[PDB]
């Protein structure tokens, strides 16, 4: 399938780095708000995931990866972008500032066959998290779709396993996230008052529609959870705190991280490639540096389980730039099956 | 004023040395640490965190000079080889983290201090208190060995307490966003905890509290019906707990949860006590971490993150680990003398 990238950033670039190599996906167009000198170097040198192990060089318009020329754009407007001539299957909407319905259209106009916005959207065809509603995917009657946001594709796998386990009646989520550049580096304004405070010396609390929004992914839960995030000074990698009231209560800490052990072995023998990295079962005590360039949804850490009676708290990390472009680069692939 | 002794010269040693100076109420005499008194000067004058010390700091072979007022200061890592009896301190803040335990801290009394305060969680001390919370349960005739507790307790206590007289809470959890201290290490070192072990100011690192698990010493009812976690982040200084409980009458609205607490902080700074003036503050101004840093509160609710779906409610309060816990010990050292 052929792939055009409309923002080539922290999510961009890291499912550019994620499909790469990969024979289902083929990408020949990126568009950005420079030229193509400064995206080559970009994609060449990570301060977060190291130096990119393909050869790639810089041309007018374009840039040859591993010998693969991919054309490159600096519109502003998404309309000015010519997907359709270059044969674009689907498009990657990254830049952050098209998640609305008539923007992220566009890409349509433009000969596009398909749009996927890299976070939570306003009325889009479909919001989808692998390994929890993707089958509710109609390909005739889907073009816009939303894969919600990096701490939705951990969340809702985790709740996912709690419901069908013991049922949950309602719950709250707290997520240690790392900062985004959709902070500031130091005071600047924002329409967000603390957003707008420096990312890298202060532990920020902002709003997430994760919980909140849960519903479009699992309805039941619709009205049942709410979440807040609380950013931190770590350029990458995140965690999410759930905690739960069910309708059975679990009868052991222990019962309870069984129940996501075999949840990830369910999702392994599935069969499906797309499934195969959604739910990690971890048991060694780790912190946030041990799980950046990790793929999953989710990475459960059993021991920080706790249960009283039928309140249940558990804890599960995720690489919010790399695990959720793995699920990109994961529902390109999905969509070429249908 | 109350002679008092410091053993342990470290950032709640120094904060407390801060915080309790000026006020006529309280006298520091002594300092022990394990280094000489020339490091131990320039560490209170220059802060990372503070700023540079108000007053002016002079040092000499056996002593500091703070504004005049000599304070011998001693380097002996036995704390039975302190002369706090001769040096007249009736109260010694056992702030070196390591004597915790009660046959070591009572090695301060039987060197002539009339009460030690453990600057920390402990086993089997005469009594734990949290100011706005169980301060009156302290007897001056039974109790020497005192826990203040930690620093999420005096933040967390106050708080449960506000939503239990309120709604009456069935059980709980309690995450803490809590900024790094000196039981992590800088970089990747050997440590009786996997996960402290790990360089601090790059990792969010999850380890254990028992400031929910052993609410119950602060608030016997609450024994058992509250779990919580500490997540370590890269933040120097300056904390956060988000709670969340199960409640008995669930609160017609958000806004009736806050002005339980804009109430309850009323409460506090009219009961006339000194040392109930600082306990909650009630914010509603859209702050982050560095914003606390210096508020002397045991707790600073902030108004707008709290939540409520049915009986569940969700609040959060920040701390500032050091100032904040070291302003509770300037208030406790006050209150103890008021007995
Ligand atoms: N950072 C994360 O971990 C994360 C996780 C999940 C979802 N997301 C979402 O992905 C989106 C992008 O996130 P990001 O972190 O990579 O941010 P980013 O700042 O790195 O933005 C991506 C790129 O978009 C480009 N861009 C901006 N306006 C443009 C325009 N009009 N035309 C073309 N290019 C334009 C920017 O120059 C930048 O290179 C956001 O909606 C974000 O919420 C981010
Ligand atoms: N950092 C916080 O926010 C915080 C909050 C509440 C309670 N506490 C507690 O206060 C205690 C001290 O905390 P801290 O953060 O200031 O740590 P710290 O390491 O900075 O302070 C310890 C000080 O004790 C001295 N020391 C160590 N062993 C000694 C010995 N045998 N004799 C004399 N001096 C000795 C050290 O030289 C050091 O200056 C701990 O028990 C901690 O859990 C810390």
Same mark, same amino acid.
């Given at each position: 399938?052929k792939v055009g990238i409309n923002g080539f950033g922290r999510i961009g670039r890291s499912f550019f780095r994620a499909s790469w190599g990969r024979?289902?996906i083929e990408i020949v167009a990126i568009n950005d708000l420079t030229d193509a000198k400064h995206l080559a170097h970009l994609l060449k040198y990570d301060?977060?995931h190291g130096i990119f192990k393909g050869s790639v060089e810089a041309k007018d318009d374009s840039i040859v990866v591993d010998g693969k020329e991919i054309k490159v754009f600096a519109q502003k407007?998404?309309?000015?972008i010519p997907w359709?001539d270059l044969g674009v299957?689907?498009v990657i909407?990254a830049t952050?500032?098209?998640?609305?319905?008539?923007?992220?259209? !566009?890409?349509?106009?433009? $000969?596009?066959?398909?749009?996927?916005?890299?976070?939570?959207?306003?009325?889009? %065809?479909? /919001? &989808? *998290?692998?390994?929890?509603?993707?089958?509710?995917?109609?390909?005739?009657?889907?073009?816009?779709?939303?894969?919600?946001?990096?701490?939705?594709?951990?969340?809702?796998?985790?709740?996912?396993?709690?419901?069908?386990?013991?049922?949950?009646?309602?719950?709250?989520?707290?997520?240690?996230?790392?900062?985004?550049?959709?902070?500031?580096?130091?005071?600047?304004?924002?329409?967000?008052?603390?957003?707008?405070?420096?990312?890298?010396?202060?532990?920020?609390?902002?709003?997430?529609?994760?919980?909140?929004?849960?519903?479009?992914?699992?309805?039941?839960? !619709?009205?049942?959870?709410? $979440?807040?995030?609380?950013?931190?000074?770590?350029?990458?990698?995140?965690?999410? %705190?759930? /905690? &739960? *009231?069910?309708?059975?209560?679990?009868?052991?800490?222990?019962?309870?991280?069984?129940?996501?052990?075999?949840?990830?072995?369910?999702?392994?023998?599935?069969?499906?490639?797309?499934?195969?990295?959604?739910?990690?079962?971890?048991?060694?005590?780790?912190?946030?540096?041990?799980?950046?360039?990790?793929?999953?949804?989710?990475?459960?850490?059993?021991?920080?389980?706790?249960?009283?009676?039928?309140?249940?708290?558990?804890?599960?990390?995720?690489?919010?730039?790399?695990?959720?472009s793995?699920?990109?680069r994961?529902?390109?692939?999905?969509?070429?099956?249908?």
């Amino acid at each position: 399938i052929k792939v055009g990238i409309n923002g080539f950033g922290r999510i961009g670039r890291s499912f550019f780095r994620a499909s790469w190599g990969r024979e289902e996906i083929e990408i020949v167009a990126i568009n950005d708000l420079t030229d193509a000198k400064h995206l080559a170097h970009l994609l060449k040198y990570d301060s977060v995931h190291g130096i990119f192990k393909g050869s790639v060089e810089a041309k007018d318009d374009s840039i040859v990866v591993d010998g693969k020329e991919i054309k490159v754009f600096a519109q502003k407007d998404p309309s000015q972008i010519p997907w359709g001539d270059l044969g674009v299957d689907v498009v990657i909407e990254a830049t952050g500032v098209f998640r609305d319905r008539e923007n992220a259209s !566009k890409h349509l106009q433009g $000969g596009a066959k398909k749009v996927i916005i890299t976070a939570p959207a306003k009325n889009p %065809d479909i /919001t &989808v *998290v692998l390994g929890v509603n993707e089958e509710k995917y109609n390909p005739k009657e889907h073009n816009i779709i939303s894969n919600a946001s990096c701490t939705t594709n951990c969340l809702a796998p985790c709740v996912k396993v709690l419901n069908e386990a013991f049922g949950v009646e309602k719950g709250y989520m707290v997520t240690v996230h790392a900062y985004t550049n959709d902070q500031r580096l130091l005071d600047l304004p924002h329409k967000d008052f603390r957003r707008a405070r420096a990312a890298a010396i202060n532990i920020v609390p902002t709003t997430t529609g994760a919980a909140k929004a849960i519903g479009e992914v699992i309805p039941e839960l !619709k009205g049942k959870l709410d $979440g807040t995030a609380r950013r931190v000074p770590v350029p990458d990698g995140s965690l999410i %705190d759930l /905690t &739960v *009231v069910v309708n059975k209560a679990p009868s052991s800490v222990e019962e309870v991280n069984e129940k996501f052990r075999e949840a990830a072995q369910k999702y392994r023998e599935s069969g499906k490639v797309y499934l195969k990295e959604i739910l990690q079962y971890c048991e060694d005590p780790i912190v946030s540096t041990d799980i950046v360039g990790n793929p999953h949804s989710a990475i459960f850490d059993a021991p920080l389980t706790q249960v009283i009676d039928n309140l249940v708290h558990i804890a599960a990390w995720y690489d919010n730039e790399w695990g959720y472009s793995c699920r990109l680069r994961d529902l390109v692939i999905y969509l070429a099956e249908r």
